[PDB]
């Protein structure tokens, strides 16, 4: 008996860091190897003194009909060191909007720090990340770093809370 199901989709390209993000969230460990096929998971959570079963779906490509209809909320992911992943979030958001009313779907935007290094620095300015957030129906933006857990738990709690509020 784990509580009501909440449906959370994870959307972004293969350079985004989304497999690592979900894996840190579920296990507390950093595994870098990303999953081309994505992955479906579940995790018990507490939001406002009540238990919920969070259903996580990383579908592994652009949103399609079935995914777009299933989500309660979407976590969009790009890498702070990859322009293509950044542009892909916007495209993938537009494809969601083909199937769903965005105003009915809480969203969070995540810029991952994971792959940044001295020789491979950040490419995406915070101002541009924020402008992208306002295109995504003014959703909340977080930087994360799954190497050590920075904002990982905060991101999923945030979207869990947004979903129960709307119920």
Binding site members for GTP: 12-19, 56-60, 112-115
Structure tokens at 6: 């909440």
Return the sign of the alpha-carbon dihedral for residues 61, 65, 71, 75.
positive
Which residues are annotated as part of the binding site?
Answer: 12-19, 56-60, 112-115
* Nearest Cα to Cα of residue 164 among 41, 3, 1: 3
* Cα separation, 110 vs 164, whole angstroms: 21
- Token pair 């620095």 in the structure block, residue: 121
Contact 152, 146 (CB under 8 A): yes
* Cα separation, 48 vs 104, whole angstroms: 21
- Token pair 């491979």 in the structure block, residue: 120
């Amino acid at each position: 008996f784990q509580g009501p199901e909440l449906k959370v989709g994870i959307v972004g390209n293969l350079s985004s860091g989304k497999s690592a993000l979900v894996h840190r969230y579920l296990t507390g460990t950093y595994v870098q190897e990303e999953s081309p096929e994505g992955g479906r998971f579940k995790k018990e959570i507490v939001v406002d003194g009540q238990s919920y079963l969070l259903l996580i779906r990383d579908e592994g490509g652009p949103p399609e009909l079935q995914f777009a209809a299933w989500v309660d909320a979407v976590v969009f992911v790009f890498s702070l060191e990859d322009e293509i992943s950044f542009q892909t979030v916007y495209n993938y958001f537009l494809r969601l909007c083909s199937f769903r009313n965005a105003s009915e779907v809480p969203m969070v935007l995540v810029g991952t720090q994971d792959a940044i290094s001295a020789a491979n620095p950040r490419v995406i300015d915070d101002s541009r990340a924020r402008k992208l957030s306002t295109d995504l129906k003014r959703c909340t933006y977080y930087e994360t770093c799954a190497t050590y857990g920075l904002n990982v738990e905060r991101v999923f709690q945030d979207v869990a809370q947004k979903v129960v509020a709307l119920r």
